[PDB]
Design a protein around this ligand. Sequence first.
Ligand SMILES: [Cl-]
Ligand SMILES: [Cl-]
Ligand SMILES: [Cl-]
Ligand SMILES: [Mg+2]
Ligand SMILES: [Mg+2]
Ligand SMILES: [Mg+2]
Lengths: 225, 225, 225
Amino acid sequence: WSLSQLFASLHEDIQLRLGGDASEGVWIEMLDTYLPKRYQAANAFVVDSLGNFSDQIDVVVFDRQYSPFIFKFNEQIIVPAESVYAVFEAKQSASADLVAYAQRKVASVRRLHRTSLPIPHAGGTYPAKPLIPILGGLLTFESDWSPALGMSFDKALNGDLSDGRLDMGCVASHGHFYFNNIDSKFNFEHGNKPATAFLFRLIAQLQFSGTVPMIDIDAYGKWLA
Amino acid sequence: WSLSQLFASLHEDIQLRLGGDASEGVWIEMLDTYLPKRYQAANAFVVDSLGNFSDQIDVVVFDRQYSPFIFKFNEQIIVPAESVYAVFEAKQSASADLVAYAQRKVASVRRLHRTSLPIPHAGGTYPAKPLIPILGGLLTFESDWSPALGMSFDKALNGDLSDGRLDMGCVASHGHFYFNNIDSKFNFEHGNKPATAFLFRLIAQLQFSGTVPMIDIDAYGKWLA
Amino acid sequence: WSLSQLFASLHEDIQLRLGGDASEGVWIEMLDTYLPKRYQAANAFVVDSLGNFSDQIDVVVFDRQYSPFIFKFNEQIIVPAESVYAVFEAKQSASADLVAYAQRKVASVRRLHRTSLPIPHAGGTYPAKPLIPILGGLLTFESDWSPALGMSFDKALNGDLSDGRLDMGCVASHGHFYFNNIDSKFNFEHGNKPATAFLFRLIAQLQFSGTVPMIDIDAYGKWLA
Ligand SMILES: [Cl-]
Ligand SMILES: [Cl-]
Ligand SMILES: [Cl-]
Ligand SMILES: [Mg+2]
Ligand SMILES: [Mg+2]
Ligand SMILES: [Mg+2]
């Protein structure tokens, strides 16, 4: 027995679960199965207290226990922006158009307005908590490029380094990528367990994402009238 | 699509779930469905480490994951006082007698003894955590008064501004109320989504209620002998 | 009604659930039923990021929501060391050999390497969190000794006061024990609700065990290649 064999057997199981238009369903199932249970994953819209909506997001990772509400409307799910940790776009194959599309979706979430309130206590008032740093990314099974994880993909990822920045992602047939804040560049990792390596990159980053802030629930509630 | 429509559709769903003697069952189901999952709701007694019991509480909101124990006895549920966040009395119609009764029930919880222990750490000892500020209230479908949310109801709510104080509540046919600590007075909100407006008032207040303290579990355990 | 009667009825229920080689199954079921839901219990191996494994542990108590991963391999469960709170050895009857065996198992967990990372924030960097103080113990239904909870058992427990130290345990027919850090000695409590008294000792200690640290997930992930 070895820790390497455990990882190989986990990847075999993930590949079974996993194996364009509707490819997000299997990524949802995988992430809702293997993320720490404090997180929840779903296909969802994101909304803010100003009544603005994101695009429809293939995979939203949000707080399971501490989200204040989750709307269920016309067979869709809508989550408040303040309880979102990550957002992914899925499609069968990576291309320049899909990367740009993923960037636009992710931007549509990050441009929402998130609230965060100060916290009273007996002695006085603690400052408002920081907002969650929302991770963005893309999930595909294949790539239109040859090589799959090379200069052309890197150029596409570099097309949005602000609101639409993709922090990480997976091409299931070849590997995964993540943005390296130190060197300010994308890193590619090629390997024979891509989805599992992606999962471990995501879990490693999420544990530093903090927690849901004190939300201006009253501001959401004004829309009751 | 609009955030207002989401709230209207949530209220329609809540009204379906909701629609004296046994009216608490539907409020339990509603709150256990729509409160953040960190909370749990049930019909329960509350107990303290001195062996004292509250009255039977129609709706108790308590900590789901961090309560140290939940007794199941003779088909009743009994929760320790330290893990309670809110307590409600339900009946079909509001009246002076029901308000006074709700106040007496809520007082019977707040008069229990709650423990809170200091917290050691390598450097030294952190002070004991604050107790949860227990919210009290009343939940009805109708009112005996005309107007339902007016001077007579306000006078009844003002009959107990200490241990039995009701912080918030709902008359499902007309609106909701909450105590305004700034002006030291009750506020009524009339509207066409009462139960949902009540739910949002409760969720907004709960997020500032803190967490379960370090409980004197040993003191409870003395009752093993 | 009295708090004593609640405890007596809880113990009756626990005795129903409970009543060598495979005795751990009923202790798992009991602890996974009655521990606070933040905890989870299972028969499991423990692993560290250096690829080292503990012995197979009859009962591991670990973090339910915040464990980063739980391997499922060849019908066994494997948990990372950093998310473990307690480890128990079970057998039908206590003896010197079983105590020594429990000590060796517990040591095999505590000798694993646990990581804990510093925590950045806007202002700077908070120190790494403390590791969870792992509780060890033994769970039996009977004892080979007469008296069951006496000098011979105390001598056996005193055979390992370091990596293999057993902090607490239960002989279901007679009582429970726990290590008293103040007097540096084992205390025995004889009584007619042993398993329930043991449960309350465990819950009291766990609430001071802290939380899972920031784990070097990257270090685990190196084993993907
Ligand atoms: Cl962000
Ligand atoms: Cl209070
Ligand atoms: Cl330890
Ligand atoms: Mg898609
Ligand atoms: Mg009632
Ligand atoms: Mg055993």
